[PDB]
Amino acid sequence: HWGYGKHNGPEHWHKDFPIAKGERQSPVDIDTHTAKYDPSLKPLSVSYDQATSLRILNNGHAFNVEFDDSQDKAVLKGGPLDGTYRLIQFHFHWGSLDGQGSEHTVDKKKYAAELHLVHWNTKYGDFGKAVQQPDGLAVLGIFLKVGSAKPGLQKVVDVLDSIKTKGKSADFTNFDPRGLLPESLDYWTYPGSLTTPPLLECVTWIVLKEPISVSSEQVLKFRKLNFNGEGEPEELMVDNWRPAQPLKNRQIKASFK
């Protein structure tokens, strides 16, 4: 099966998923000098007041915080988007050390981790139909640097001991993802893909410029998770990031001067 190792990591994925070498793959390096300010881009509208988290899951690649997406509650709109995108889950990518972990890079700078809030376009009715469309998903990406603790992250950190291994889940209700957002919603945007198999080219990426700070202790708890299932040899869940892919025929647009 695909994963993040020497034998099954990103440089192997193209064998089972040939779109890995496609024209709109993610992540990418954001060259800040080349990204053009687009005065036509709108402010991002992040409406998470009514978000209903259900559960947290270790899927063997990351942990997913899942939301009830059966109504228009938690939605992303505006920015570069046409229409309404519903929050379905968030997860992170992180490193074995603070100098790597992010998927997007900024002038080749790697952050310690990257948060992905995944949303689907309600015009396609369900997530499985949305991923078959070039405008099916919007993923809001947020960089993590190590410094001060993020108080709004601690409820996630504290539940990880209960989902150490692949296939473990835990009730995770009433988690407010507003506590994971930075102050500024300034962003870069470009058309891309899922960054894990099946690598579908269905994503409008919205990457916030301002990182959030998390503590060394918070990210060290991410690194205690396991890729393996219960009663299997321990492989620490670290370095679950895909490197930057070729930009090809794409423009990265900035919301800000």
Ligand X SMILES: [N]S(=O)(=O)[C][C][C]C1234B567B89%10B5%11%12B85%13B98%14B%1061B821B326B%115(B%12724)C%13%1416
Residue 93 C-beta: closest distance to ligand X, Å: 7
Residue 50 C-beta: closest distance to ligand X, Å: 22
Q: What are the CA-CA distances from residue 108 to residues 39, 205, 248 (Å)?
A: 25, 18, 17
- Residue 119 tokens read as 């949303």
> How do strand 212-214 and strand 85-94 relate by DSSP bridges?
unpaired
Q: Binding of ligand X at residue 255 (CB under 6 A)? A: no
Question: In this structure, is the dihedral angle defined by the CA atoms of residues 173, 112, 230 and 167, taken in order, positive or negative?
Answer: positive
What binding mask, one character per residue, do residues 13-32 give for Zn ion by CB under 5 A, x or -?
--------------------
Largest CA distance in the chain: 54
Interface of this chain with Zn ion, residues 34 to 93, rule: CB under 5 A: none
Interface of this chain with ligand X, residues 185 to 204, rule: CB under 6 A: 194-196
Let me know the angle formed at the C-alpha of 171 by 167 and 172, rounded to the nearest 5 degrees. 110
Cis status of the peptide bond prior to 27, with omega within 30 of 0:
yes
Q: Binding of ligand X at residue 226 (CB under 6 A)? A: no
| Phi/psi of residue 52, nearest 5 degrees | -115, 100
Is the separation of the CB atoms in 112 and 76 below 8 Å?
no
Cis status of the peptide bond prior to 233, with omega within 30 of 0:
no
Q: Binding of ligand X at residue 105 (CB under 6 A)? A: no
If phi > 0 it is left, if psi is from -120 to 50 it is alpha, else beta; for residue 159 that is alpha
SS3 call for 217? helix
Judged by CB under 5 A, the number of residues near Zn ion is: 1
For ligand X, the binding residue among 41, 139, 160, 163 (CB under 6 A) is 139
Distance (Å, whole) CA 76 – CA 125: 16
For Zn ion, the binding residue among 116, 119, 166, 221 (CB under 5 A) is 116
Q: Binding of ligand X at residue 86 (CB under 6 A)? A: no
Residue 92 C-beta: closest distance to ligand X, Å: 9
For ligand X, the binding residue among 116, 119, 166, 209 (CB under 6 A) is 116
Residue 13 C-beta: closest distance to Zn ion, Å: 14
The answer to whether the annotation marks 195 as part of a ligand binding site is yes
- Which residue lies nearer to ligand X by CB, 9 or 147? 9
Catalytic residue check, 61: yes
Catalytic residue IDs: 61
What residues line the site for Zn ion (CB under 5 A)?
116
Binding residues: 91, 93, 116, 195-196
What residues line the site for ligand X (CB under 6 A)?
116, 118, 139, 194-196
Binding residues for substrate: 195-196
Binding residues for Zn(2+): 91, 93, 116
